[PDB]
Design a protein around this ligand. Structure first.
Ligand SMILES: C[S@@+](CC[C@H](N)C(=O)[O-])C[C@H]1O[C@@H](n2cnc3c(N)ncnc32)[C@H](O)[C@@H]1O
Ligand SMILES: [Zn+2]
Ligand SMILES: [Zn+2]
Ligand SMILES: [Zn+2]
Ligand SMILES: [Zn+2]
Length: 488
């Protein structure tokens, strides 16, 4: 029930610790950094979580589906498999457990180039293990043929971007022996995916790359304004996306034209390591809030980026959300929540998605809203310090509203979930007005491709009111195992 949430939170804690350790290394002068000399942030984070009892399913083998782990789930590090107890061994490709007097495989890691042909997508050929011997793992995978017991398959790319993918449950059908190219016998196993499971994510991505893709009903809702086109897909009905004036960047009315923020004195990328003063690093409380790869280290009340009069180059480490969308986004028709947003590739945890763009207005003007309050985003105090607290145990609301009813960007189409994979992060760079930060969405999960993007709308129950002025209700259809059942 809450096992999905405990899995996601466990991973979130792991990656938070990883990015903290890495931040710590990136703050050091290049000469004293450990990244070169065998820094293993995954192993340190792993150790920290283990020594605090954070590992799930430890000391127990599971055959078949693991609670809270779903088909399509992606992992950046192999040790995540260890932390969740999906796949116990540190290095070995095959994991197994006792079954009667024998042993059957519970899990395999097919690391590498995988076959990408669509008419064989349910079938997998797996190499075993100078001759390979029918012992331990190989023997267990062979016994799986006799028992017809399910095997978990994890696809491993030969880093950071969707390195391990859980592809679901397979049955082992046969095995044989042949000379490998190293010159000795190896074992080969044929597995078949069990019918009834969600489609493989690589299959969906592959089908999505075609121009004859099912349901494709618009090439670019951006109308050529975003640097990459944002398409629209509808496999549900024949409805087309709502019309609105697409707006890439937030445009300030004259009542809040930016007063020029306090600038920067660095001729190159800002970092803690370079020792002369950077004002923008002090704005962030003496830290760089991003890792050097662009990922947010961890949610904060406010992040300060370098602005228009900082002498920094575009690739400064404090310049991230200001460069706009980089992911290949698209909107698509949901069954019961109107239009939603998703991405055509994996999104690494910590990645910036997009801004909530629209017309800025004061609250008072906000309470007089007529027409569409579906696209009203109230700024102020969405910061969630849960993760920061959890990690510490290991180691002012705003009146203003963004109205995207008439003018906005793709962010207006992002739906609500009670178990969200995104969060809202306040960012300042072209001004220092605390009342009206940019609302920047970041990933708080490693997001598999084509998984719907969602954040917490954070409405208070029984405070959303009628056209005539009284309490209104709306049900939440987010489908999460722990759904709070009402949107407002
Ligand atoms: C900012 S709009 C998001 C895009 C919208 N779905 C559309 O088609 O234009 C918010 C509206 O989407 C719908 N919505 C978003 N999340 C929902 C959820 N979890 N359950 C039910 N409706 C949802 C609600 O009607 C809500 O008023
Ligand atoms: Zn800078
Ligand atoms: Zn600087
Ligand atoms: Zn600066
Ligand atoms: Zn819900």
């Amino acid at each position: 029930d809450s096992s999905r949430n405990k899995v996601k939170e466990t991973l979130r804690l792991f990656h938070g610790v990883c990015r903290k350790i890495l931040q710590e290394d990136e703050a050091k002068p290049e000469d004293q950094r450990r990244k070169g000399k065998g820094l293993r942030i995954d192993f340190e984070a792993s150790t920290i979580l283990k020594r605090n009892g954070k590992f799930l399913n430890s000391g127990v083998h599971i055959l078949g589906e693991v609670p809270g782990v779903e088909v399509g789930d992606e992992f950046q590090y192999r040790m995540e498999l260890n932390i969740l107890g999906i796949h116990k061994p540190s290095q070995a490709g095959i994991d197994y457990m006792k079954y009667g007097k024998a042993k059957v495989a519970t899990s395999i890691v097919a690391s590498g180039g995988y076959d990408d042909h669509l008419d064989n997508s349910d079938v997998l050929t797996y190499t075993g293990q100078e001759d390979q011997k029918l012992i331990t793992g190989n023997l267990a995978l062979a016994t799986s043929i006799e028992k017809q017991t399910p095997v978990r398959v994890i696809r491993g790319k030969h880093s950071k971007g969707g390195n391990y993918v859980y592809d679901g449950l397979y049955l082992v059908e046969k095995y044989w022996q042949q000379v490998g190219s190293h010159g000795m016998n190896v074992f080969k196993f044929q597995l078949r995916r069990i019918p009834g499971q969600p489609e493989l994510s690589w299959v969906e991505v592959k089908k999505s790359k075609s121009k004859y893709r099912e349901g494709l009903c618009k090439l670019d809702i951006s109308e050529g304004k975003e640097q990459s086109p944002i398409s629209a897909v509808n496999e549900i009905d024949d409805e087309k996306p709502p019309l609105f004036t697409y707006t890439v960047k937030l445009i300030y009315p004259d009542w809040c034209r930016p007063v020029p923020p306090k600038s920067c004195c660095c001729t190159t990328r800002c970092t803690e390591a370079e020792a002369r003063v950077c004002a923008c690093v002090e704005k962030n409380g003496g830290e760089i809030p991003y890792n050097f790869d662009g990922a947010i280290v961890g949610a904060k009340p406010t992040i300060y980026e370098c602005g228009p009069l900082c002498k920094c180059p575009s690739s400064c480490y404090l310049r991230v959300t200001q460069h706009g969308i980089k992911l290949p986004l698209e909107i698509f028709k949901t069954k019961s929540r109107g239009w939603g947003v998703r991405c055509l590739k994996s999104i690494p945890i910590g990645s910036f998605i997009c801004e909530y763009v629209g017309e800025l207005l004061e609250d008072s003007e906000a309470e007089r809203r007529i027409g569409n309050d579906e696209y009203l985003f109230d700024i102020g105090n969405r910061y969630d310090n849960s993760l920061a607290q959890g990690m510490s145990e290991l180691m002012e609301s705003s009146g203003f509203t963004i109205d995207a009813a008439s003018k906005g960007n793709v962010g207006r189409f992002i739906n609500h979930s009670c178990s969200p994979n995104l969060y809202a992060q306040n960012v300042l760079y072209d001004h220092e007005d605390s009342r009206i930060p940019h609302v920047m969405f970041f990933a708080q999960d490693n997001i598999p491709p084509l998984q719907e993007l969602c954040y917490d709308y954070n409405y208070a129950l029984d405070q959303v009111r009628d056209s005539k002025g009284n309490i209104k209700q709306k049900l939440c259809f987010c489908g999460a195992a722990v759904c709070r059942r009402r949107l407002y």
